[PDB]
Symmetry: none
């Protein structure tokens, strides 16, 4: 019980002190995506930054061209107090990389090209409705939410030229503008911020409250349950659990399907438990294949839940190196697949819609920008779905033992050294069931050694995020 | 800043499980105050407990007579599943002890007489509007609120025959009744509960929100400020602070007034800071003297704030021993004085109405039932005043160093050994200002060693209260 409780953490937002009322002394550089500069919040921000602010229009996605343009600007215009990116407004998918929002691609390349050009002014990435901050906040853009995943990794990899992330309110009035320009002047060590009418909120990680025994509001598991990546490590273990809890029919998918290693043994396992088993080969980013799968479900066993476990973590790279192709391949099973899943099942009144995220999206991991972005999309999509009145849960896993991605010893060793320890599957799954019985929207489930993790995480840069974890605070004293 | 944040804690109420649907197997004993059994909620509870429930009418306040009656009842009727007290409905002040609500007197004597008689069934004390539980809840009876202070100490001193405290809703309908009889059957380890229309809530302690400059909009300190107990330890330090922050005129009161030890030095201190000082000898329970003090304030310096620091903690005693006389002397400067202060200033539109409480009222302290009751009144009165649209704050201090009650070394040693550490006055006052800047209604301000405190506090009995303090959870794991 308390073993599972100890695994569960929650992102929350605390009010922080009002900033000062002077705009920065030095000049700002504002980066705009020229075909996506029309949104009201972009206009309001440009107006708040004032006419002295230099504007750079980021056209297309050409790293070398931008580097040369930025170098010229630095030469001509001198040094900047900060760089303020409005590239998040470009939500349309990149025409050559169908799983990458244009704004996300352009933000990556901007971070690369600023380094290339030696423009060292701290980079601030602005979004509008990419987080749910404050009671009753509406996360209106899960695409912009992905950009926070990337941003946190930029802060780990380039801490000395990263400013942070600020989410703007729906209405950027004079209060909100003064709060924005104040933070850009000095942010008081905060770097993950939401501006809202009631004040300025900052992102915090906290222990979740211990499960209240006997208090579950989870519907019984029944009918058909789709587990994407269901032939993989965590997915198989999740499929078994669901079978024990009363699913009538488990639909497992993956690109390899019945050819996936271990698939024949997993099917026989599930059939011993008295469950119908369908194992289908198909890319979760393929909308038509998903539709066809849902259309052929038994009339006796309609879809009641989705567990999205499809994902890859390999072929990622440092921010300074990551290509748009590698980014696309990392986003595919996460952004594109989850969006299909959401759209195809929105009208089905599901009991559960569970997205498997990662701690790489909670606090960030160096070397894993694309994976962090892709999983940050899932967290944001769950908040978005709740605002529409749909069920959703995003579970950001730490490291599993025994099965799945993280059982390579070299990977394992790296993680244990950072203090992200391998969970026993029974404990991880038990903590998941607690989350689902509480009907939480988003949680991290992870076994930590804070005495290892906190000093490693904050070596280069303090983290206000962790100020609300007493073990982290205590490690750093 | 964050050091002062770390001193501040906040009582909150979280939803817990719906209880079961079976009435207790064994028979209940219901204790009623015969002249005060008319209230609607008392009738509704008696009806919910059903006709099999044995009734005991607690007449007067005679410990020995009740002990003999209870012994007879046990003889005749057997042992009981639990004892359900409805004595809180007696809000009228005791005829012989003008600071003691009759119900509070009778609850003490009941807890004493049950022990005397060897009735071991867990004692549950019911109240109606004695806490503010849930958003927009109205604490309508601060007198009944005092009973929760006493109750928590009964739980520390007699953990094996204490059930707990349950606050009923305004309307005890069938849902509320089934919730009550379900909790009496099995409370799932909870012992501080509120039944409301939306469900069952339980009492929780959390770290308070970090300071945000000017959020509660505290007005500037100005005009005349009354500090009762102003010649005493904390009071004098509070007077000094207010003088530094621009009070025009400090009115310090105590029973000894200008004869109080150190009073001539404190006057000179405050006057060096440019403040006018009035020191009056004045029992804060004397309504007429307080009225005369308020009537003589200059029109150029009207009353703007009250800081209620009057109080005694000595000559308390264990629950088993405490007399009504001792109880009266502890309640006097708290209940009676605060009530006068509330009534005489209700129409003055104060900027601040600040009551000095104790952690003895937050979580309880063995050997200090009378003090805990008296201070729990202050917490409840602050919530009550907020429901009326009046300003109020209750500050439940831990232990001060340097000045005041707790500076005796053997007392100090006992506290340090329980993990309640002595605060530096500047840090305690800094935390108070944070609380007043946020305009919080109730907070505890205390320096804790949770690794010492949690195991000592829960040695004999678990505490759900502390499950929401991660340092407590970690100490116990
Ligand atoms: N293991 C951990 O410690 C951990 C920590 C954080 C988060 N996670 C998340 O948990 C989930 C499960 O991870 P795991 O450890 O079970 O990894 P795994 O054993 O590699 O399983 C991943 C599954 O996703 C499938 N997949 C990959 N891309 C797909 C696509 N486009 N369409 C459909 N299926 C696809 C894979 O099969 P094919 O290759 O045959 O398609 C595989 O069955 C992942 O989303 C991962 O991001 C895991
Ligand atoms: N010190 C702590 O660590 C701590 C912890 C929790 C709570 N508190 C609370 O903080 C407040 C101040 O405590 P302290 O440590 O400053 O103790 P203190 O030095 O004894 O101050 C108490 C003051 O109250 C006065 N007083 C007592 N009964 C009174 C009455 N009936 N009418 C008017 N004045 C009366 C006393 O003076 P006379 O005797 O001359 O009346 C004295 O000036 C108290 O309410 C106490 O319960 C203190
Ligand atoms: C690679 C497989 C995978 O799922 C991984 C990326 C994840 O689940 S993330 C878990 C690994 N690490 C983290 O979550 C914490 C990263 N934190 C760290 O403390 C690193 O030392 C810093 C200093 C921040 C450099 O990145
Ligand atoms: C006596 C001066 C005074 O103000 C004191 C009573 C107060 O401020 S209350 C603070 C003293 N102690 C407490 O708050 C903690 C009580 N906690 C404890 O852990 C006790 O050891 C238990 C085991 C519960 C028995 O009472």
């Amino acid at each position: 019980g308390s073993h599972m409780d100890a695994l569960r953490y929650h992102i929350e937002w605390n009010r922080v002190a009002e900033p000062g009322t002077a705009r920065p002394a030095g000049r700002l550089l504002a980066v705009i995506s020229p075909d996506h500069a029309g949104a009201p919040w972009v206009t309001a921000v440009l107006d708040a930054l004032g006419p002295d602010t230099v504007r750079f229009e980021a056209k297309g996605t050409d790293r070398a061209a931008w580097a040369a343009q930025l170098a010229q600007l630095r030469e001509d215009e001198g040094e900047f107090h900060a760089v303020v990116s409005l590239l998040a407004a470009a939500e349309a998918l990149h025409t050559d990389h169908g799983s990458v929002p244009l704004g996300l691609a352009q933000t990556l390349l901007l971070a690369q090209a600023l380094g290339d050009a030696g423009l060292t002014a701290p980079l601030w990435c602005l979004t509008r409705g990419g987080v749910a901050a404050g009671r009753g906040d509406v996360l209106s853009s899960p695409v912009q939410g992905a950009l926070w995943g990337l941003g946190r990794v930029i802060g780990l990899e380039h801490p000395d030229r990263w400013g942070g992330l600020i989410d703007l309110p729906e209405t950027v009035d004079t209060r909100a503008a003064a709060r924005l320009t104040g933070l850009l002047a000095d942010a008081g060590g905060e770097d993950q911020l939401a501006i809202r009418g009631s004040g300025v909120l900052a992102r915090r990680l906290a222990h979740a409250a211990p499960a209240v025994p006997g208090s579950g509001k989870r519907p019984p598991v029944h009918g058909s349950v789709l587990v994407t990546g269901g032939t993989g490590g965590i997915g198989g273990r999740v499929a078994r659990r669901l079978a024990e809890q009363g699913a009538a029919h488990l639909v497992l998918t993956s690109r390899r399907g019945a050819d996936a290693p271990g698939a024949a043994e997993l099917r026989a396992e599930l059939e011993q438990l008295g469950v119908r088993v369908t194992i289908a080969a198909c890319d979760a980013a393929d909308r038509e294949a998903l539709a066809a799968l849902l259309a052929e479900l038994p009339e006796d066993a309609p879809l009641t839940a989705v567990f999205h476990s499809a994902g890859v973590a390999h072929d990622d790279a440092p921010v300074a190196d990551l290509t748009l192709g590698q980014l696309d391949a990392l986003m595919r099973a996460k952004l594109t697949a989850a969006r299909h899943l959401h759209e195809l099942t929105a009208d089905l009144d599901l009991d559960a819609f569970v997205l498997f995220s990662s701690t790489a999206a909670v606090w960030g991991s160096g070397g894993h920008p694309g994976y962090a972005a892709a999983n940050a999309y899932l967290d944001a999509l769950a908040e978005h779905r709740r605002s529409l009145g749909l069920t959703a849960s995003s579970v950001a896993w730490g490291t599993w033992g025994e099965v799945g991605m993280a059982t390579d010893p070299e990977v394992h060793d790296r993680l244990v050294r950072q203090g992200v320890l391998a969970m026993e599957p029974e404990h991880a799954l038990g903590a998941l069931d607690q989350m689902l019985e509480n009907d939480d929207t988003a949680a991290a489930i992870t076994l930590m050694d804070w005495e290892m993790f906190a000093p490693a995480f904050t070596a280069n840069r303090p983290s206000a995020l962790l100020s609300t974890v007493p073990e982290a605070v205590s490690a750093l004293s």
